[PDB]
Structure formats: C-alpha cells, structure tokens
C-alpha cells in the first residue's frame, strides 16, 4: 500500500484537508491507508471513510447512469449504429466502479466488521456493506445479480436487527440505515410496499422519540426524517 509509510494520524489529518479541498479520491486513499494500520476507527474516522468513498462512488454512479442511458437509446428502433464505443466506455466506468465497491467491501471484511463490537460501529459498517453491495447490484446483469442483491439484503438486515435492539429510534445511524434499506427495497428489490412500510414505521417511531432529544440531536434526527418523508412523497 502506497500509504504504508505514513503515520496514522498524518493520514487522518490529510483526509480532512482533502475533504476541504474536495479531493475525494485522495481522501479515500488516505482513509484506506488509515484503516490498513489495523486499529479500530473512531466515530469521526468512520465518517471520514464514509464521506470519502461515498463521493468517489457517487461520481462513478452518476457517470454510469449517463452512459447507460446513452447506450439504451442507441439500442432502440431507428437508432443509428455507432459501433462498440458506448458499450466499451460504459464498461470501463462500470469496472472502475466495481473496483471501488470491492475495495470498500474488502476493508469491511479485512477486518473492520469482525473487530466492531459496539452497536454504533457495527451497525455503521454493516450498513456500509449493504450500501456497496447495493451499488454493485445497480450495475449487475449476470449470473450473480441475485447473489449480490441477497448480500446487500443480508448486511442491511443484520444491521437492522442490531439497531433495533441497541439504539433509540431517533439514532441518526439507525435512521440512515433504515433510509438506505428502504431505498434498497424500492430501487433494487422490486419491493415498493416494503420500502413504504419501512419508511413510514421508521418515521413514526422516530417522531415519538424526539421529545427525549437535545436541540442539537433533534436537528440531526429530523434532517434524516425529512429524507424519509421526501421518499414517501415520491413513492405515494
């Protein structure tokens, strides 16, 4: 690893600088280096890891959707034949995206999840595992699409079971997990009713627990609740 010679603390410091500079590829490489030091991650460090890779894969997903749309239009009746280039370049971006997902899943499997014992870390990492299998599922078309989807489902479900046992209904990690699992149901699993039910129950149980929160926690929780509500408005 090219970050093997850099101090753990220096990698974290530079990941924060890269975030300020909107250099998310650098940020992700710095945080990968920090994970590979072998120590567990603090809450702030887990969030740096997540922000870095979410921005990297987000750019790849947006590009893949543009190119896939062009490719699908090229295959409609009346469309002029343009040769292999659209497919080739969509495949190039797709392969790079799969590489980033495999990198994140590899960090989770070696060895972030197995060392994560507290609910906040374990739920965070299992949600991340669900998310990056979900991104693999968005582009999957072959023999393994069903297995990729089930891997995402399984990780989200384990995270859900822990979060319901160990976290209050307003906990932002729990809320963000439920949000993303509801997106999985709607966009990946062809289960819009499950998506709507999950989002509604999550919203309502959080609403009833807001009275326990400080002003700052109330702001954290309601920001995510608003995304649940936005989706319910889109879906119903």
């Amino acid at each position: 690893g090219a970050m093997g010679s850099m101090e753990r603390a220096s990698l974290i410091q530079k990941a924060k600088l890269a975030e300020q500079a909107e250099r998310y590829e650098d940020m992700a490489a710095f945080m990968k280096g920090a994970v590979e030091k072998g120590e567990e991650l603090s809450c702030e460090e887990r969030n740096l890891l997540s922000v870095a890779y979410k921005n990297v894969v987000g750019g790849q997903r947006a590009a893949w959707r543009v190119l896939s749309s062009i490719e699908q239009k090229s295959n409609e009746e009346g469309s002029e034949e343009k040769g292999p280039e659209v497919r080739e370049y969509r495949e190039k971006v797709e392969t790079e995206l799969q590489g980033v997902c495999d990198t994140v899943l590899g960090l989770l499997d070696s060895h972030l999840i197995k060392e994560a014992g507290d609910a906040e870390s374990r739920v965070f990492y299992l949600k991340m595992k669900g998310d990056y299998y979900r991104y693999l599922a968005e582009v999957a078309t072959g023999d393994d699409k069903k297995r990729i989807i089930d891997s995402a489902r399984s990780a989200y479900q384990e995270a859900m079971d822990i979060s319901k046992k160990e976290m209050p209904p307003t906990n932002p990690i729990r809320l963000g997990l439920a949000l993303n699992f509801s997106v999985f149901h709607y966009e990946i699993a062809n289960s819009p009713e499950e998506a709507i039910s999950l989002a509604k129950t999550t919203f309502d149980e959080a609403m009833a627990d807001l009275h326990t929160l400080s002003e700052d926690s109330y702001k954290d929780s309601t920001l995510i609740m608003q995304l649940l509500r936005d989706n319910l408005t889109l879906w119903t």
Partner: peptide
C-alpha cells in the same frame, strides 16, 4: 420518477 434519495454524505 427521479431516483429515491439515499443518505447524503454529510
């Protein structure tokens, strides 16, 4: 039909 919103990077 825009895509459902997942958790943004905060």
């Amino acid at each position: 039909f825009p895509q459902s919103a997942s958790l943004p990077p905060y």
